[PDB]
Amino acid sequence: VPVNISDLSIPPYSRLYLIFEGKNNVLLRSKVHAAPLKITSAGEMQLSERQWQQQEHIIVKPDNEAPSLILSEFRRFTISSDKTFSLKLMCHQGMVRIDRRSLSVRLFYLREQPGIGSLRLTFRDFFTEVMDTTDREILEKELRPILIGDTHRFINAAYKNHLNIQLGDGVLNLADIVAEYARIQKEETAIMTTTVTTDSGELFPTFHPWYTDDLSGRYKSVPMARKADTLYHLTPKGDLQIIYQVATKMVNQAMIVSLPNYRHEW
C-alpha cells in the first residue's frame, strides 16, 4: 500500500520497510520525533531512570490539577557551581520558552553513554486563562507590570501547591526560571554576547600564529581569558553557539559567541 512519506509512524519494537525503484538513486533527508509522553494524572508520580531516558519529551496536561514529577538518578549538566549563574546561562541559551498555557524548558543531563542527552518538559496549563493571549506587543506590555511586580500571579493558586520538580539530587522551582526569563526579556530592550557572520577580517595571515593550513584571513579574537572548559551548542533552529569561561576567581561570567544559521552556511 502507498504511504505518505511526509509522515510515517513506527510503533515500538517494530520495523518499517520502504521499497524503492531500481532506476535512478535513492536519496532522502529525514527527521525523527519521539512520541510526547502525555501526563494527565494528579497528585504525585516518580519516574524510573529509563522511563525518562526513553521519551525525550514529557508534556503534562492537568485535567483538574497538575501532579508533581520526581525524576530519579537525574544528574543535571552543570557548567558551574553557581545556581543563579547556571539559570542565567540556561535562559540566555534560548532554552526556556513561553507560549499560551505552555511553559517549555529543555533540561540536559549526563549518562554513562559517551555524551550527554536532552529532555524537553512542556507544562500545559501553567498560565491563567486571562494570559492565554500574549502574542501581541500590547498584551505583553500590559502584563509587564505583573512581571515587575507580583511575579507569582500569572499562575493561579490552584497550581501553586505543585510548582517544583525533584531531580536526582537537586530541586528545580519554576518561579526562578520564569523570573529569569522575565528579567532577560526586560533587559534586552554579566554575560557578554557577540554576533559574527562572514565578517571580522582583520589581516589574519602571519601576525600572531604565522600561517598554517588553508585558513582564510578572517581574524577575530575573544576579548578576555577563559577556562580550559568550553561548551558547544548546536541550536535545533540552526544557530551555532560557543560558550567560553572567563578564568576569574571572584567573577564568573561568560562570552557567548553566536554564528547564526551555521548548519546551512558552514
User: Cα dihedral sign for 153, 157, 158, 159?
Assistant: positive
Q: Going by DSSP bridges, is the β-strand pair 57-60/102-110 parallel, antiparallel, or unpaired? A: unpaired
Q: Going by DSSP bridges, is the β-strand pair 68-71/44-47 parallel, antiparallel, or unpaired? A: parallel
Q: Round to whole Å and give the CA distance between 168 and 52.
A: 12
Q: What is the resolution of this structure in A?
A: 3.3
Q: Round to whole Å and give the CA distance between 97 and 106.
A: 9
Nearest to 52 by CA among 130, 3, 117, 5: 117
Nearest to 98 by CA among 30, 27, 37, 147: 147
Q: Round to whole Å and give the CA distance between 243 and 257.
A: 7
Strand partners, 98: 103
Cell numbers at 84, concatenated:
543563579
Q: Round to whole Å and give the CA distance between 4 and 84.
A: 47
Burial per residue of 48-58, b for 16 or more beta-carbon CB atoms within 10 angstroms, e otherwise? eeeebbeebbb
CB 245 within 8 Å of CB 222? no
User: Cα dihedral sign for 246, 168, 121, 99?
Assistant: negative
Cell numbers at 229, concatenated:
572548559
CB 122 within 8 Å of CB 97? no
CB 79 within 8 Å of CB 229? yes
Tell the residue number behind the cell numbers 506587543, with chain if given: 137
Burial per residue of 30-39, b for 16 or more beta-carbon CB atoms within 10 angstroms, e otherwise? eeeeeeebeb
Nearest to 224 by CA among 238, 244, 198: 244
The structure was resolved experimentally with cryo-EM
User: Cα dihedral sign for 51, 54, 58, 61?
Assistant: negative
Angle at 221 between CA 219 and CA 224, to 5 degrees: 170
